[PDB]
Every structure is written in structure tokens, then in C-alpha cells.
Design a protein around this nucleic acid. Sequence first.
DNA 1: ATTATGACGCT
DNA 2: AGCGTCATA
Length: 425
Amino acid sequence: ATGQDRVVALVDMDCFFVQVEQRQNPHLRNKPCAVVQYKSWKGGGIIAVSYEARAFGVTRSMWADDAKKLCPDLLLAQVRESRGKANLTKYREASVEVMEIMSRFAVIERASIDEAYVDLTSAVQERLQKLQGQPISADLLPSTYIEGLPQGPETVQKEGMRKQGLFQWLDSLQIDNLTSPDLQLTVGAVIVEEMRAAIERETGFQCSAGISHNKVLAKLACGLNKPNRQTLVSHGSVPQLFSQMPIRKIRSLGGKLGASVIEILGIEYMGELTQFTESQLQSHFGEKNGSWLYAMCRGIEHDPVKPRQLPKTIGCSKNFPGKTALATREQVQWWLLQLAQELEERLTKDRNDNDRVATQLVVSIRVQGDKRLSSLRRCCALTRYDAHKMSHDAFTVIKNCNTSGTEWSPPLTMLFLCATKFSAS
DNA sequence: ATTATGACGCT
DNA sequence: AGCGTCATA
């Protein structure tokens, strides 16, 4: 297998939280704007940045006071705050709208609130059967980029480059110089064009997509041309694409594994991995990672698009950084309640909409001076969707953690509640 | 003082 | 059951 068996798309809503605020407030449209939460500490922390604002150098995880220095005209939208914490309901609801529309076209895996994987293999077959011996016009692919094209001999403008590359691709399909998987990708891209058109018409939200044979290539493809554009990445484009592609760019290699691959093997780019035998890769990085790397540097990935549109867990948390770390038993109880109260509302909605019930409650807390996200995880049975019950049980489970008092030590930097193990209802 | 959520793999 | 990795709004 050349890993050309499937057609897979990754769709990413461009600066999704910004878009949601821009649809609601027309004033923010087509302007440098960012979404922040909690204005009191340094203007608030930016979590979403429009493309107009990015040009000024405004980035995520930046303090709003700092972003205003780069972009004096930056407009800000504030995350809804409920019970003393961030409330993301508006963005979760908008996300559902998008997911439902995507559902009509093909089978979808929800990757995050803003992005989803699409398995288009069956859909492209139908289209290939439905439309037989029919040439694919350039007009059907108005925002599609073919990676690696144009090649050889109005290039100076970006849109000129796009069309010329598209024409070369199409002419080669037309002529029969392009393989059946290349045709499958193209039809896949046609469908993604329509899916994206349906999303914008019906929600007003724009998005970018990558089309390829697996999830990793599709995701890489998606980021090549943004915003509001889609990029086809063929099996043939992979060698040139990987040759100058930093290892950290590939999904799952952005962390410690990727760094160890670079450090151990002494390589910079993804394509350099082809030198090494599978056994060599497995020896260094383990059987599972080795096998995965051997195939992936050749553009082959087998992870399936899971038929899942609903989150597997439902959770809420609040950090209590630095001085605000919780020191009294009463403080700890109160926030657990606030956390439990938001959770109950979300769980009941979930039950009515999605015909399922969570059976387990997980408590995660973090203590002062700990590098790790979570210092401790602990679980209890979840039998009633009741805030007072859930909050009280959560406390019962973690009360032993306290070193000595009714003071609590070490002070809590984080409280986390997660509903898990859903069952059909 | 990146904040709040996620999905997984390992053991 | 509990911990660590990776990811993005």
C-alpha cells in the first residue's frame, strides 16, 4: 500500500472564537480583534486572534495590555464569565452548528471545538459513480491549492499561482498522467469545497481544510494555506514537502518525542527519517512509535477517522495561580460547588440532547510548586446530576490530600471536575 | 500568572 | 485505577 487507499479531510475553523464574536457583533468584522478572558489581570489573556490582528504580531497566550502595544487599534471581545469562571457555552453551541452541517456530507470525527476530521472515501466513490467520465472544471475548486504546484515553466500574485497550479493538476488528471488516488483526492476536494460553502452559507463561519489520504497529511495540508482556503496534498507531493519540513510540524511530534527524534538521530526534517530502518526506529523510540515513524515519513498513516461527533468527557476547571491559591477549607468547598453547578447544567443538557448519562466523576487538583498540570487524580461514582452531591463527593475524595490545618496546605492552584464513562440513556 | 478543555497511551 | 503526553480555543 502507498497509503493512497483513503480520502481524508481536516477542517479547521479560522480563529473560531473570534468569528463567533464577529458574527454576533458586526462592528468587529474585518478588523484586528482578539478574544480574551478575565480583563483584570493585564487586560486578560488572549485565546483567539483574528488574521488582521496576527499581522501586527498579536499571538495567543499574550496579555491584552501587551497586544495593545503591538496593535493599538486592537478590538477585544470578552469570554462570558459565570460563577467566577470562564463560560464557553457560546463557542460550544456554535461548534455544534458547524458539526451538524459537516455531518450531512460524510462521517466526522470531532478533534476539538474548532476542528474535525472527515472520512470522504465512500462519498468520493458515489460522486465518481454518479458523475461518470465527466471532467472536473477549475470552477469547482475556487479556493483549492495543490501543494507543490505550479512547477517548471501572472505568477507574481498569489491567486495567479493558485490557478496555474490547479490547471497543471487538472490537465494531468484530464490527460490521465495522474493516478486514480489523485482523482479521488480531487473529487474529495470538490466535496470539501461544497461542505465549506454550506458551512459559510448556513452559519457565516469561514474555515480552512486539508485534503489527503490520512489524518496527519490532511492536518499538515490544512495549515499550508490560511485563512479560508483548502489545500490538496497528494502522495506524490510528500517527498519534496517532507524534505524541508521540520519534524515538530507533524502531528504528535511537536513535543518530547519529536525532540528526541531530532536529538537522537541528528536530523532536522521529516524526510530524513526514510534513511533509517524500521527496526532502527523501533529500537530508539519503541515498537509502536518506530512503526509509526517509518510509515509516516513515507506519507503513510493508518489511524482511522473515528465515527464520533460528541465529546467523550465533560469537564470544567479553574486555575488559582500564585497568590490566589486556595488556603481555606471553606474556599475549596465553594469553588467545587461552582464547578459542580456548571457541570450539572452541562450534564443535563447533554442528557436531553444526546440521550446519554455519565457514570463517573473525576477530581483533579494541583498544588503550589508543582510543574505538572495535575498533581493528583481521583474518581468517584456519579449517580445523581446534582451539584450539591457532586461537589460534596468531590471534596470527600480529596480531603485526605490536605497536609494540616481548617487551613488547607499546600494551597491549591487548580480544581478540576470531569464527567466520564457515558452510557446510552 | 498562559486559561480551560480535550483525547490518548502507559502501567 | 492513576499518571504523563500532546494539542488548541
